[PDB]
Amino acid sequence: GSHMASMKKKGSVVIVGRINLSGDTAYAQQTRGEEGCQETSQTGRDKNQVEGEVQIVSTATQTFLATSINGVLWTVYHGAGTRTIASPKGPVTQMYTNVDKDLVGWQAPQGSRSLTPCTCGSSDLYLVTRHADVIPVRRRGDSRGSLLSPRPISYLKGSSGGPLLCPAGHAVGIFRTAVCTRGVAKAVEFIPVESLETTMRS
Numbered sequence: 001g002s003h004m005a006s007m008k009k010k011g012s013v014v015i016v017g018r019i020n021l022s023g024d025t026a027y028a029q030q031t032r033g034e035e036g037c038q039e040t041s042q043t044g045r046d047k048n049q050v051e052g053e054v055q056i057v058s059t060a061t062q063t064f065l066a067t068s069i070n071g072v073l074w075t076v077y078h079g080a081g082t083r084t085i086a087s088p089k090g091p092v093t094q095m096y097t098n099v100d101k102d103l104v105g106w107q108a109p110q111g112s113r114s115l116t117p118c119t120c121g122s123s124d125l126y127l128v129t130r131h132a133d134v135i136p137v138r139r140r141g142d143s144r145g146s147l148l149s150p151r152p153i154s155y156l157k158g159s160s161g162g163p164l165l166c167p168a169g170h171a172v173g174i175f176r177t178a179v180c181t182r183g184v185a186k187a188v189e190f191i192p193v194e195s196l197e198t199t200m201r202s
Ligand SMILES: CC(C)(C)[C@@H]1NC(=O)O[C@@H]2CCC[C@H]2OC/C=C/C(F)(F)c2nc3ccccc3nc2O[C@@H]2C[C@@H](C(=O)N[C@]3(C(=O)NS(=O)(=O)C4(C)CC4)C[C@H]3C(F)F)N(C2)C1=O
Pocket: 062, 063, 064, 065, 077, 078, 079, 099, 102, 153, 156, 157, 158, 159, 160, 175, 176, 177, 178, 179, 180, 185, 189
């Protein structure tokens, strides 16, 4: 538009829940409902206590995941764009933005726990979805893995920004893309942790 005084502002990304990997069972928890999410997106002020490594996040129009690795909460550019994230003191600006990697990052929220970047060189991986499904994935390239059990894409939708982990629970990558045939996801692509570690200068 040409009328700046009425131009709107996009809201912040908001943490609305988490994937609980604390104990012996993985399960999703919601920490904020739709109304509070909308309000928090507009104000950027989120006083809710944050816990864990994998957050469920939402904008006004999308919901996906975000994962803390080495003190950074990482997600996909196609979900977050350039948006701030809501936090107790107001909106927090991205610390990393790389559209070429489909990647953004913010400082990890107080109370979150961070995954350690994997140095195992292991190719037996585990994708964690927004429904707390743990999906075996065989690493097939620097940024590619095949699902041991293919699944309709509906089962993976909304899980971009989630982790692929190694057998020891280290972060190997950030889920960003599915490779499908006739609506069935047979493979995934991810941002490898080394591409993050480069981004971080670790
Ligand atoms: C057909 C398909 C499966 C929808 C699509 N596959 C696909 O295109 O495969 C091609 C062929 C082989 C590799 C790949 O090359 C293109 C790479 C695309 C990309 F990913 F790098 C990407 N870079 C962007 C950068 C800037 C702006 C937009 C961008 N948009 C992109 O891709 C778009 C987004 C991505 C997506 O849906 N991700 C997931 C997800 O859950 N999102 S989400 O949470 O629901 C949500 C949309 C709320 C945020 C994990 C997959 C879940 F559904 F399984 N896409 C399309 C796909 O996966």
